[PDB]
């Protein structure tokens, strides 16, 4: 498991999402203000993060991340 | 306004994850319908109907009146 | 010592052998389904088999408004109100489709035919479908409920205030003016209760029926 | 009472006892009640449509 | 017995019906050789000054034993090509419509309660 | 033998865009499986009905009664009912007008 590969693949699968505008999808991309997303958008995005790799992260935890880099670190160090 | 601002999040999570486990229906249209089941009515409405609509979402999840398979 | 009215036959000229075969077949049906004891006015839940489905089970809860017929076909009518719509169903006891019959509340009202409920206010006939039974002491007389009822106003379906119905479960003093109880009492027939020759004495018949029923065990 | 004379039951007088039924023939003496193939006779389980 | 000149209460949420009108819906024709109409017999209604096809789903007239005997002559509005005009039904409809042939599958996919 | 699996495979292999099957509890009355599916044109829905009843007729059910296609005169909604499972072919428009899925998952109220 490579952390660089992990962040690359999570970024890739995020890019696969269609509605997102590829303006500022940075390592620290915010959702509410930078992009304009909301709770449903982010919960769906995290579920998508649980579409190829993962399937072990409890739902309760995902609400305290609200930032892509914390999610990357959690999914990297949880497996 | 809702029974709990975070309960809807858990309901949505459970809906998506259980929908992952379908055997017959397409996952795409199930997901689209699940999106519609909250998007078109559960935004900024009054604080009275919130309880009823959370109840209907949760009883759809429960499914004693038909399980979508 | 309660003998369900079906086994008591109408006065007529039919051949006793018919009634013996009738009762034999009935009792032979009572040993696959428990046909409980219920009076008119009781509340029953009937569970039957859907003929138009692929083997589903149907439940219906209501009040037994009328109990008529005899022999292997006799029936009872269950009235109820569902979603504000007043429905009745006529169920045949010995039909091979009724799975079971729960006496959910064994009662007994002032009149032996609760048809006027079709005119009483909707709440005197409404009952909850998912309502639990109520126990009763074995060596206790069947309770005699006393609930007089209040009627929908003008057009009663069968003109209940006449003497010949002899209904005693309606509040007449309210919906009918005092005058209307003087025109509706010129039909009294004071001679009909004292006609000694219209009385069907069915003691010697119910006795032999009991001999038969008990011997069929 | 006699056999049906309509011109769709002229046959099927075969399996019937031809001259008559003699109880003294003693051929597997008949039970108390003979039933058709499609009668929900008493004493049987209540029907189900599954 | 839903025959010509009998008032029927439309129970289907009646995007058309259910709105006030001084008349009440009346049956002007029954699609059976004889006039009498029983469950499932689709009839014609004069409602709001307009002619619309109907479908009987309950009547006060006693039927067979194991089928319900309502207390109001209930009808569902159906479009000419069989599609129900409404989108819902609240009053109970008998389970005796899955029986004898007719346009009944759609009318059961739209209701919610049975007896 | 007949089961939801083969007919669903029929629909998917027949290139029917949308499928949604809801299982009805025995506490209800109507049936067990209740399917709502879509199609492109009225002739395509007629074709789906054609093929489904064709397989249902050439497979089994000599004991069980035959099944008629209901709604042929209509063009935008067709439906079939079998002994235990019922299918509803609908154009997307009328399908989203009669919000059937909500009803058959939430029987206890109206929409
Ligand atoms: Mg009358």
């Amino acid at each position: 498991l490579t952390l660089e590969g992990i962040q690359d693949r999570v970024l890739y699968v995020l890019k696969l999402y269609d509605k997102i505008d590829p303006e500022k999808l940075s390592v620290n991309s915010h959702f509410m203000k930078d992009l304009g997303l909301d709770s449903l958008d982010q919960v769906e995005i995290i579920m998508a993060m649980e579409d190829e790799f993962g399937f072990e992260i409890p739902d309760i935890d995902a609400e305290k991340l609200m930032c892509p880099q914390e999610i990357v670190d959690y999914i990297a160090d949880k497996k | 306004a809702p029974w709990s601002r975070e309960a809807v999040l858990s309901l949505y999570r459970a809906l998506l994850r259980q929908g992952r486990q379908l055997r017959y229906t397409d996952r795409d249209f199930y997901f689209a319908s699940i999106r519609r089941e909250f998007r078109k009515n559960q935004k900024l409405e009054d604080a009275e109907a919130r309880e009823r609509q959370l109840e209907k979402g949760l009883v759809f999840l429960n499914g004693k009146l038909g399980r979508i398979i | 010592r309660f003998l369900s009215p079906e086994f008591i036959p109408r006065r007529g000229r039919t051949d006793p052998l018919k009634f013996q075969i009738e009762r034999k077949d009935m009792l032979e049906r009572r040993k696959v389904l428990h046909i409980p004891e219920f009076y008119v006015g009781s509340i029953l839940r009937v569970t039957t088999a859907d003929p138009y489905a692929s083997g589903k089970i149907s439940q219906f809860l209501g009040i037994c408004i009328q109990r008529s017929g005899r022999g292997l076909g006799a029936t009872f009518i269950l009235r109820n109100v569902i979603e504000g719509q007043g429905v009745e169903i006529c169920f045949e006891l010995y039909n091979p489709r009724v799975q079971e019959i729960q006496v959910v509340k064994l009662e007994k009202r002032l009149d032996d035919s609760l048809l006027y409920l079709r005119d009483a206010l909707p709440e005197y006939s409404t009952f909850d479908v998912n309502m639990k039974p109520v126990v009763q002491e074995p060596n206790q007389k069947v309770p005699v409920n006393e609930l007089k009822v209040k009627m929908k106003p003008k057009p009663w379906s069968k003109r209940w205030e006449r003497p010949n119905f002899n209904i005693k479960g309606i509040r007449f003093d309210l919906c009918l003016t005092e005058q209307q109880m003087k025109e509706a009492q010129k039909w009294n027939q004071p001679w009909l209760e004292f006609d000694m020759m219209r009385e069907y004495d069915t003691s010697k018949i119910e006795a032999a029926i009991w001999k038969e029923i008990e011997a069929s065990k | 009472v006699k056999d049906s004379k309509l011109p769709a039951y002229k046959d099927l007088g075969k399996n019937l006892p031809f001259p008559t039924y003699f109880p003294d023939g003693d051929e597997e003496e008949l039970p108390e009640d003979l039933y058709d193939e499609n009668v929900c006779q008493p004493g049987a389980p209540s029907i189900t449509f599954a | 017995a839903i025959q010509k000149m009998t008032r029927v209460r439309v129970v289907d949420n009646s995007a058309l019906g259910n709105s006030p009108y001084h008349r009440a819906p009346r049956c002007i024709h029954v699609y059976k050789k004889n006039g009498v109409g029983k469950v499932g017999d689709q009839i014609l209604l004069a409602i709001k000054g307009q002619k619309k096809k109907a479908l009987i789903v309950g009547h006060c007239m006693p039927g067979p034993r194991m089928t319900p005997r309502f207390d109001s002559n209930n009808v569902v509005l159906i479009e000419d090509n069989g599609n129900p005009v409404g989108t819902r039904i609240k009053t109970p409809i008998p389970t005796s419509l899955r029986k004898r042939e007719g346009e009944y599958s759609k009318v059961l996919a739209i209701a919610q309660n049975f007896v | 033998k007949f089961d939801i699996d083969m007919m669903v495979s029929l629909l998917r292999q027949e290139n029917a865009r949308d499928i949604c099957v809801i299982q009805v509890p025995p506490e209800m009355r109507y049936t067990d499986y209740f399917v709502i599916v879509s199609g492109t044109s009225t002739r395509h829905l007629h074709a789906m009905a054609f093929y489904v009843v064709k397989m249902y007729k050439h497979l089994k059910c000599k004991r069980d009664p035959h099944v008629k296609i209901e709604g042929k005169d209509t063009d935008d909604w067709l439906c079939v009912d079998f002994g235990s499972m019922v299918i509803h072919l609908m154009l997307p428009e009328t399908r989203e007008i009669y919000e059937l899925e909500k009803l058959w998952t939430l029987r206890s109220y109206d929409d």
Side-chain angles (χ1 to χ4, degrees):
Chain A
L1 302 177
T2 56
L3 306 181
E4 299 180 359
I6 288 160
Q7 57 80 17
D8 190 4
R9 61 156 292 277
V10 300
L11 183 65
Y12 176 91
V13 300
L14 260 289
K15 300 275 180 199
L16 300 180
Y17 190 76
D18 57 356
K19 194 178 72 62
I20 52 163
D21 293 328
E23 178 270 337
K24 193 277 195 179
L25 180 48
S26 306
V27 178
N28 310 329
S29 179
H30 201 66
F31 309 118
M32 293 175 295
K33 192 177 185 301
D34 179 70
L35 208 166
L37 304 180
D38 57 356
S39 294
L40 300 188
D41 293 334
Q42 56 80 10
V43 69
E44 176 275 348
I45 289 282
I46 293 171
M47 179 57 188
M49 192 74 72
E50 297 291 355
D51 81 326
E52 290 174 355
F53 281 90
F55 302 94
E56 72 286 314
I57 301 175
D59 51 3
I60 183 57
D61 301 334
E63 287 78 39
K64 83 188 182 62
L65 290 294
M66 192 48 195
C67 280
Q69 64 92 346
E70 288 79 351
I71 302 167
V72 177
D73 300 334
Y74 192 86
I75 191 172
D77 76 332
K78 192 73 174 184
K79 299 186 293 183
Chain B
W3 179 274
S4 37
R5 172 60 169 81
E6 298 204 347
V8 56
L9 274 293
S10 63
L11 171 62
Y12 202 80
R13 286 285 199 194
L15 290 159
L16 272 62
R17 280 177 171 176
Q18 69 187 138
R20 180 59 49 74
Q21 299 172 357
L22 268 281
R23 293 181 297 188
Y24 301 110
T25 78
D26 183 11
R27 314 299 173 79
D28 303 329
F29 295 145
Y30 176 87
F31 155 74
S33 179
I34 291 294
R35 174 184 182 82
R36 297 160 181 258
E37 201 161 18
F38 300 135
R39 185 65 174 82
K40 77 182 194 174
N41 73 331
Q42 193 164 342
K43 294 292 106 182
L44 71 171
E45 67 282 7
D46 191 310
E48 179 63 10
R50 306 285 186 168
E51 292 76 357
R52 196 83 170 189
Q53 59 90 352
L54 262 295
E55 167 65 322
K56 75 98 177 179
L58 269 74
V59 72
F60 168 57
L61 181 148
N62 185 332
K64 295 289 178 62
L65 315 175
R67 299 291 293 175
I68 177 160
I69 192 70
Chain C
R1 185 55 49 186
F2 148 84
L3 158 55
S4 61
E6 307 173 307
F7 300 89
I8 300 283
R10 295 265 186 193
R11 186 163 47 179
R13 295 158 76 189
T14 308
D15 200 0
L17 175 53
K18 186 203 165 35
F19 296 142
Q20 293 192 15
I21 294 166
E22 277 278 31
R23 293 191 294 256
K24 183 262 284 170
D25 196 322
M26 280 187 294
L27 302 159
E28 186 174 350
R29 172 58 182 179
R30 259 163 196 265
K31 293 173 189 177
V32 57
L33 157 64
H34 183 255
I35 303 298
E37 161 173 33
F38 64 94
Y39 289 68
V40 66
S42 321
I43 290 69
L44 281 64
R45 191 207 299 280
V46 162
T47 310
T48 75
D50 179 313
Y52 316 113
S54 68
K56 299 284 164 286
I57 293 76
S58 175
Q59 305 212 343
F60 176 95
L61 184 140
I63 187 179
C64 175
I65 60 172
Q66 192 200 33
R67 218 197 179 188
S68 58
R70 278 103 171 94
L72 209 155
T75 73
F76 55 77
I77 313 179
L78 299 188
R79 174 153 170 80
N80 186 295
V81 194
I82 309 298
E83 302 278 343
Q85 184 75 57
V87 318
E88 295 84 338
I89 292 167
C90 201
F91 279 109
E92 327 187 43
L93 278 167
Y94 304 87
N95 180 309
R97 251 149 58 181
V98 301
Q99 300 299 349
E100 68 184 3
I101 311 187
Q102 274 188 345
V103 173
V104 175
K105 177 156 65 172
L106 186 158
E107 302 179 354
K108 173 182 174 188
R109 291 213 195 176
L110 271 165
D111 321 322
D112 61 354
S113 180
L114 277 294
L115 276 163
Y116 45 54
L117 299 189
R118 289 164 172 168
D119 305 326
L121 304 169
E123 63 93 348
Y124 281 69
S125 287
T126 304
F127 302 88
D128 183 66
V129 305
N130 186 10
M131 73 104 80
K132 291 76 170 176
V134 306
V135 71
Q136 182 164 281
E137 170 70 7
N139 67 339
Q140 189 69 7
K141 316 306 295 301
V142 167
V144 177
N145 189 320
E146 300 286 351
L147 176 57
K148 308 293 205 74
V149 308
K150 289 178 282 176
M151 311 264 67
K152 283 184 208 175
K154 202 179 182 300
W156 293 348
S157 77
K158 201 78 74 59
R159 196 192 299 273
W160 301 114
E161 66 273 21
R162 300 285 192 199
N164 80 78
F165 291 78
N166 208 9
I167 284 302
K168 300 176 172 183
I170 301 295
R171 275 177 180 172
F172 295 145
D173 57 58
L174 176 151
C175 193
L176 271 56
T177 61
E178 171 50 48
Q179 180 52 221
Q180 291 176 342
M181 254 72 71
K182 183 171 64 177
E183 280 71 350
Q185 291 296 111
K186 298 300 98 198
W187 310 28
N188 202 19
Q189 302 185 283
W191 69 84
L192 202 67
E193 76 193 349
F194 300 134
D195 190 355
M196 302 181 288
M197 293 268 285
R198 298 174 66 95
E199 295 176 343
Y200 189 13
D201 174 89
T202 63
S203 71
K204 281 185 174 62
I205 292 171
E206 61 81 16
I209 291 164
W210 269 125
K211 303 282 252 189
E212 190 164 293
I213 292 165
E214 68 86 35
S216 72
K217 289 181 182 60
Chain D
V1 193
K2 92 187 182 59
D3 297 329
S4 61
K5 72 98 172 169
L6 301 79
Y9 314 137
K10 252 172 184 171
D11 74 325
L12 62 68
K14 185 179 69 56
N15 305 8
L16 285 294
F18 167 70
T20 175
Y21 173 85
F22 301 101
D24 310 299
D26 186 358
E27 312 302 342
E28 305 291 359
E29 169 161 0
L30 300 167
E32 192 190 46
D33 288 327
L34 283 54
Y35 290 88
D36 182 309
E37 187 187 20
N38 290 333
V39 171
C40 280
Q41 50 188 321
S46 299
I47 56 170
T48 311
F49 299 94
Chain E
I2 311 311
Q3 53 178 79
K4 300 173 84 95
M5 308 297 288
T6 186
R7 275 82 67 84
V8 305
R9 58 181 281 183
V10 177
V11 286
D12 62 335
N13 113 105
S14 217
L16 180 84
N18 277 126
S19 59
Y21 191 93
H22 49 289
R23 295 307 84 172
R26 281 180 178 275
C27 169
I28 53 167
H29 183 254
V30 185
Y31 287 51
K32 271 175 57 172
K33 304 279 181 178
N34 55 342
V36 174
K38 310 290 188 183
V39 174
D41 299 326
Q42 61 120 310
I43 70 191
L44 191 68
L45 286 188
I47 179 51
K48 284 183 70 172
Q50 188 166 332
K51 287 184 276 285
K52 202 71 153 182
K53 298 271 276 288
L55 178 56
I56 292 159
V57 299
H59 52 70
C60 211
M61 184 171 208
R65 295 302 94 71
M66 296 273 148
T67 59
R69 183 266 193 194
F70 290 63
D71 64 356
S72 69
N73 313 315
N74 298 334
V75 164
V76 181
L77 288 172
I78 52 168
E79 182 54 24
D80 278 315
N81 73 76
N83 276 10
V85 65
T87 52
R88 291 289 104 86
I89 313 183
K90 195 183 290 183
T91 301
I93 73 185
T95 60
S96 307
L97 275 71
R98 190 164 164 80
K99 67 191 305 302
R100 298 158 301 176
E101 75 306 350
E103 289 286 322
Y104 305 143
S105 291
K106 298 168 175 177
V107 179
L108 295 180
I110 196 172
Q112 61 86 6
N113 189 356
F114 301 78
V115 313
Chain F
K1 186 57 178 184
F2 287 114
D3 200 340
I4 183 62
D5 55 2
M6 181 134 76
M7 78 94 67
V8 169
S9 74
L10 230 87
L11 275 79
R12 289 182 293 173
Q13 170 267 312
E14 275 293 317
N15 211 1
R17 55 176 122 179
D18 184 359
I19 310 183
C20 185
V21 44
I22 172 63
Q23 72 204 42
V24 188
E27 187 271 311
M28 205 44 61
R29 316 282 243 84
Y30 185 41
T31 179
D32 310 5
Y33 293 135
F34 188 97
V35 184
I36 299 79
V37 294
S38 174
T40 54
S41 66
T42 293
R43 201 259 281 179
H44 191 262
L45 303 178
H46 217 269
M48 300 312 85
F50 260 134
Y51 201 5
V52 170
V53 301
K54 182 63 174 60
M55 60 76 63
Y56 177 84
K57 290 179 84 62
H58 101 264
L59 185 69
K60 219 183 221 176
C61 285
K62 189 74 190 68
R63 64 189 72 176
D64 291 314
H66 291 260
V67 175
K68 59 172 179 292
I69 291 295
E70 204 65 19
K72 277 181 170 177
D73 44 8
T74 314
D75 60 320
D76 56 7
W77 183 3
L78 191 67
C79 58
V80 205
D81 68 325
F82 300 91
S84 188
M85 64 175 179
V86 312
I87 176 66
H88 290 272
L89 287 281
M90 277 187 296
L91 288 177
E93 293 75 1
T94 55
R95 182 245 191 280
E96 64 177 357
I97 291 291
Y98 308 95
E99 53 273 21
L100 292 184
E101 282 61 4
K102 194 168 189 181
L103 236 64
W104 283 107
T105 61
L106 303 170
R107 301 290 297 166
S108 179
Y109 70 90
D110 64 350
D111 299 86

